[PDB]
Enzyme design. Structure first.
Site, mmCIF file in Angstrom:
data_model
loop_
_atom_site.group_PDB
_atom_site.id
_atom_site.type_symbol
_atom_site.label_atom_id
_atom_site.label_comp_id
_atom_site.label_asym_id
_atom_site.label_seq_id
_atom_site.Cartn_x
_atom_site.Cartn_y
_atom_site.Cartn_z
ATOM 1 N N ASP A 75 -1.101 -8.093 -2.183
ATOM 2 C CA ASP A 75 -1.926 -8.021 -0.808
ATOM 3 C C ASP A 75 -1.795 -6.208 -0.356
ATOM 4 O O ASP A 75 -1.277 -6.318 0.979
ATOM 5 C CB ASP A 75 -1.500 -8.937 0.432
ATOM 6 N N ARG A 107 -2.447 -2.808 6.628
ATOM 7 C CA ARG A 107 -1.959 -3.700 7.413
ATOM 8 C C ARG A 107 -0.452 -4.117 7.058
ATOM 9 O O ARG A 107 0.387 -4.526 7.443
ATOM 10 C CB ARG A 107 -2.622 -5.000 7.621
ATOM 11 N N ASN A 108 -0.542 -4.005 5.655
ATOM 12 C CA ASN A 108 0.805 -3.939 4.778
ATOM 13 C C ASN A 108 1.584 -3.007 4.178
ATOM 14 O O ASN A 108 2.025 -2.904 3.109
ATOM 15 C CB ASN A 108 0.729 -5.223 3.617
ATOM 16 N N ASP A 113 6.376 -6.050 2.208
ATOM 17 C CA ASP A 113 5.910 -7.585 1.860
ATOM 18 C C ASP A 113 5.213 -7.592 0.423
ATOM 19 O O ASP A 113 4.465 -8.497 0.353
ATOM 20 C CB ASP A 113 5.039 -8.261 3.149
#
Ligand SMILES: Cc1c(NC(=O)c2ccc(C(C)(C)C)cc2)cccc1-c1cn(C)c(=O)c(Nc2ccc(C(=O)N3CCOCC3)cc2)n1
Length: 264
Positions: free
Chosen positions: A127, A131-132, A145
């Site tokens: 992912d 945003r990550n 993450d």
């Protein structure tokens, strides 16, 4: 590393993520950390606990480190490195008018270094997106993450037709076959460079997820952001070959980025 929860001091709410509440705190009254409180039912916990050592042993300056866990209670805690500037996507939008193109390329380099490391460890992010990625007090971008998508219990996230599935960051073979590999992280990285050079715009804005899927399967690609030189666009575009085996490795992308830097 099983962290003793007695050693954690909660200080501030950082908001909510796909495991629920995240807090800012200190470990042994000195080190800043983030603490995920894993919302009951949100995670495949015994699978995670069973497999978490590999993830904690991932160690690199451009990864947001997983320092340890607290598993002797419920909810379980995941303790990570703290990043004072929050997620890259917001940081981009908040400072949009201040970035020089050299700084955008530096951000790409930071992420590419982290991903080359993960690639070298045969470990998938799954992912990757602005945003990550998170940003520290010195403007260093780090990947966050990595690997955790695997433990998500949420049909809206796990189904490719779910409203939370990272469709806009996914190559055709993920959308069609759920085939994750180094090369699906490569595709996502291209889209991440695009988020960086567009200063945090949504990819395929105004298209739904299914419209995005439909049109990328047919060859639609994200346009060159105004701030991306043609050399930079060539790098991001290379990540988007329809065929996975035609996409570069993170080793090649890193060399590509460093070459642009030297030319500059
Ligand atoms: C990672 C995260 C989530 N998201 C998740 O936990 C999450 C879980 C699973 C997934 C998968 C889908 C991949 C499984 C994705 C995300 C939700 C809320 C906060 C944080 C976070 C973490 N860290 C480690 C920070 O240093 C930090 N730091 C902040 C620092 C500042 C601010 C802030 O409010 N700011 C920034 C400075 O300017 C003022 C406003 C916010 C966060 N914020």
């Amino acid at each position: 590393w099983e962290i003793d929860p007695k050693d954690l001091t909660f200080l501030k709410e950082l908001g909510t993520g796909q495991f629920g509440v995240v807090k800012y705190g200190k470990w042994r009254g000195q080190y800043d950390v983030a603490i995920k409180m894993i919302k009951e039912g949100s995670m495949s916990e015994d699978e995670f606990i069973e497999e978490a050592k590999v993830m904690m042993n991932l160690s690199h300056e451009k990864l947001v480190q997983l320092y340890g866990v607290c598993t002797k209670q419920r909810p379980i805690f995941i303790i990570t490195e703290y990043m004072a500037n929050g997620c890259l996507l917001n940081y981009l939008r908040e400072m949009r008018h201040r970035f020089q193109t050299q700084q955008l390329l530096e951000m790409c380099k930071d992420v590419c270094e982290a991903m080359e490391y993960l690639e070298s460890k045969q470990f998938l992010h799954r992912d990757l997106a602005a945003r990550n990625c998170l940003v520290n007090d010195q403007g260093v971008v780090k990947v966050s993450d990595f690997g955790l998508s695997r433990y998500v219990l949420d049909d809206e996230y796990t189904s490719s037709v779910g409203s939370k599935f990272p469709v806009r960051w996914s190559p055709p073979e993920v959308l069609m076959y759920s085939k994750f590999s180094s090369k699906s992280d490569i595709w996502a990285f291209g889209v991440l460079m695009w988020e960086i050079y567009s200063l945090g715009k949504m990819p395929y804005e105004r298209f739904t997820n299914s419209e995005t899927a439909e049109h990328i399967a047919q060859g639609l690609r994200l346009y060159r952001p105004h701030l991306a030189s043609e050399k930079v666009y060539t790098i991001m575009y290379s990540c988007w070959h329809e065929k996975a085996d035609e996409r570069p490795t993170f080793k090649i992308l890193l060399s590509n980025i460093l070459d642009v830097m030297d030319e500059n």
